[PDB]
Amino acid sequence: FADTVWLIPFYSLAGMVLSLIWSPGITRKTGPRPAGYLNILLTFFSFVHALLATVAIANQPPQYLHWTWLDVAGLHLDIPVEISILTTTALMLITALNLMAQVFAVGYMEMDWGWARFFALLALFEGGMGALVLLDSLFFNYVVLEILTLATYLLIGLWFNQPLVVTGARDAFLTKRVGDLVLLMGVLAIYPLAGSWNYDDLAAWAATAQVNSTLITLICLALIAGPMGKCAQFPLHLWLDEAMEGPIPASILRNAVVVATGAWVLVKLTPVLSLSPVALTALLVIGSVTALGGTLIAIAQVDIKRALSYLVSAYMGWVFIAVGLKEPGLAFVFILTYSLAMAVLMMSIGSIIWNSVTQDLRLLGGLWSRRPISGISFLVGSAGLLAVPPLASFFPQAELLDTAFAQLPWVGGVLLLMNTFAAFSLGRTFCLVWGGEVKPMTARSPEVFWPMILPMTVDLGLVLHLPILMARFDWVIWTQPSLATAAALTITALLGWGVAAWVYLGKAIPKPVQFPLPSVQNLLAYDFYTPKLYRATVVGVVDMISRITAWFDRTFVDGTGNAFGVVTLLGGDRLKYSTTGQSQAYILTILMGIAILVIA
């Protein structure tokens, strides 16, 4: 095939219109299941197509093609698609992940009547993801990037009867829209400079460019701030903490959307972002800050679903760091491994939640003996994210140690440190959900049925084969071994996980652990009071002046338009008295007419 791969984003776009045939007001009889079934069928057929297209482009050059969206006077909106290897590979990655999450949803979303609304939005992501990875125009890489913002709004707000979803979906749309809107300012000021937006004309332009320093500084800062909000990075990160309403888009959003929506735009902008060595240092700063913050906050959480989204923020800040060192290959490689591991992690946590209703880490307990798979899957998804050079996420985080040590060493000091705190979080998330004494809420925890642990175990296999899948085909990631640094990440991670296990499986400390400093514990627990920050700086401003403007309109403008009228009323109501009703007065006015016009 490989010449019709551009039809992949339509299969799912054909499932996003057909699944709505079953929404509860259209069928009213026998509804809720074949919508999901046919969406699974479409996803499987689009994954087979992508696999075949990848096999057919094993040893071949990128065969671009393009259509014309519209050609008005000045601009020529070109929609080009690239059929390189990393495009069909990303299509496989997206469709397989959607297949896993949808087979999961078949099991999780029972006892739920909205499958029209759920699987149609899950099909509109699988289509949007494909259209984002295929199309390589900075303009059409923003069109879908905004359509997916709208889709995120309706998907988080799936069950809108819950008052904390209509508040989480509000932030998830506004926070993610502002970033996508300064990205518009950036894509808008790159046309007079480069004459196009094709990721190739931009590459050629950035190769030979001598334009102002502050100008490209500003436009690349905008190009940063777009994906900065799309990838849940500081300070646009509260939306992800509140986007944990509605399980398993969370298994796909934190895993297949957050990973290849802003990071994909940020990586393909490496040639442009390389032009200013200030956008790069700002990129390093943002990535490192969000990594440290995400790890430290994930350590201080009690909700198992929010003790993994901050880790998502941190491991996307890692990609921000990598792309800050002019290393796009490392980012494209690490997205794959991180996505596989986080899929296993989120599916295991979802399986625990489905049968152990609470999400409080303080209410979940001994599950290892009675729930093995869901535990070993979590453990393997853990090992495939930090360390264990056997597992595949080690390789891409090895070059970023060598590269961050060759140049700008302090950044490595974060990447190393980010490897222990992120290991202490997962540790305390395993030692709290699977180890320890069993508690009332999880006193009787049956393992879940076949559709929730099939994808989980099928996705647990991919992670175990990734390392060996990069052996058969010599896809070397970190050229120089230099085991002096390969023995650092492992030591850091193992140390973190070990201290985590000791603190919680040690019964040598009170279990509701308190920090020597109590004021920082309830500061990392409330993510540095980011909401109280928002409602203070932006909202508080945008609201205040808003309540001014309307009031102004209601008082100064409107009134100024009414005063005239009112005056013209008074001028008539108190000038009728000139007709006094006395004929002698009328003759006086007639006589005052004369002897005055005679004077004038």
Ligand X SMILES: CCCCCCCCCCCCCCCC(=O)OC[C@H](CO[C@@H]1O[C@H](CS(=O)(=O)O)[C@@H](O)[C@H](O)[C@H]1O)OC(=O)CCCCCCCCCCCCCCC
Ligand Y SMILES: CCCCCCCCCCCCCCCCCC(=O)O[C@@H](COC(=O)CCCCCCCCCCCCCCC)COP(=O)(O)OC[C@H](O)CO
Ligand Z SMILES: CC1=C(/C=C/C(C)=C/C=C/C(C)=C/C=C/C=C(C)/C=C/C=C(C)/C=C/C2=C(C)CCCC2(C)C)C(C)(C)CCC1
Binding site for ligand Z (CB under 6 A): 373, 447, 450, 453, 457-458, 461-462, 465, 469, 472
> Could you say which residues in the range 399-438 bind ligand X, by CB under 6 A?
420-421, 424, 428
DSSP 80: E
Which residues on neighbouring strands pair with residue 236, listed in sequence order?
Answer: 233
| Phi (first) and psi of residue 499, to 5 degrees | -65, -40
Which of 34-42, 243-251, 477-485, 514-522 is the region at the interface with ligand X (rule: CB under 6 A)? 514-522
Site string for ligand X, 34-73 (x = CB under 6 A): ----------------------------------------
CB 294 within 8 Å of CB 313 = yes
- Check whether 465 is labelled as a binding-site residue: yes
Closest separation in Å from C-beta 561 to ligand Y: 4
- What are the tokens at 429? 């998330």
Go through 94-132 and write b for each residue having 16 or more CB atoms within 10 A of its CB, e for each that does not: bbbbbbbbbbbbbbbbeeeebbbbbbbbbbbbbbbbbbb
Residue nearest to ligand Y (CB): 565
Site string for ligand Y, 566-585 (x = CB under 6 A): --xx----------------
446 in contact with ligand Y (CB under 6 A) = no
Q: Compare residues 450 and 577 and give the one whose CB is closer to ligand Z.
A: 450
Binds another protein (CB under 8 A): choice among 14, 21, 51, 154: 154
What, of ligand Y, ligand CLA, ligand Z, none, does residue 457 touch, CB below 5 to 8 Å by kind? ligand Z
What, of ligand CLA, ligand Y, another protein, none, does residue 84 touch, CB below 5 to 8 Å by kind? none
237 in contact with ligand X (CB under 6 A) = no
CA angle 392, 397, 398 (to 5 degrees): 95
> Could you say which residues in the range 517-576 bind ligand Y, by CB under 6 A?
557, 560-562, 564-565, 568-569
Residue 264: CB atoms within 10 A of its CB come to 23
The two most distant CA atoms of the chain are separated, in Å, by 120
| Phi (first) and psi of residue 69, to 5 degrees | -75, -60
502 in contact with ligand X (CB under 6 A) = yes
Site string for another protein, 420-449 (x = CB under 8 A): --------------------xx-xxxxx-x
Q: Compare residues 83 and 296 and give the one whose CB is closer to ligand X.
A: 296
Q: Which amino acid is at 568?
A: T
Closest separation in Å from C-beta 550 to another protein: 4
Q: Concatenated DSSP letters for 87-152? A: HHHHHHHHHHHHHHHHHHHHHHTTT----HHHHHHHHHHHHHHHHHHHB--TTHHHHHHHHHHHHH
Closest separation in Å from C-beta 340 to ligand Z: 11
Expressed in angstroms, the distance from the first to the final Cα of the chain is 99
- Classify residue 291 as left (phi > 0), alpha (psi -120 to 50) or beta: alpha
534 in contact with another protein (CB under 8 A) = no
> Could you say which residues in the range 11-30 bind another protein, by CB under 8 A?
23-25, 28-30
Binds another protein (CB under 8 A): choice among 207, 212, 471, 543: 543
Compute the 3-state secondary structure of the chain and give helix, strand, coil in percent, each to the nearest 5.
70, 5, 30
Site string for another protein, 336-375 (x = CB under 8 A): -----------------x-xxxxxxxxx-----xxxxx--
| Phi (first) and psi of residue 538, to 5 degrees | -95, -65
Burial-class residue 358 by CB neighbours within 10 Å (0-12, 13-18, 19+). middle
Closest separation in Å from C-beta 471 to ligand CLA: 7
Q: What are the residues binding ligand Y (CB under 6 A)?
A: 557, 560-562, 564-565, 568-569
Report the binding-site residues for chlorophyll a. 465
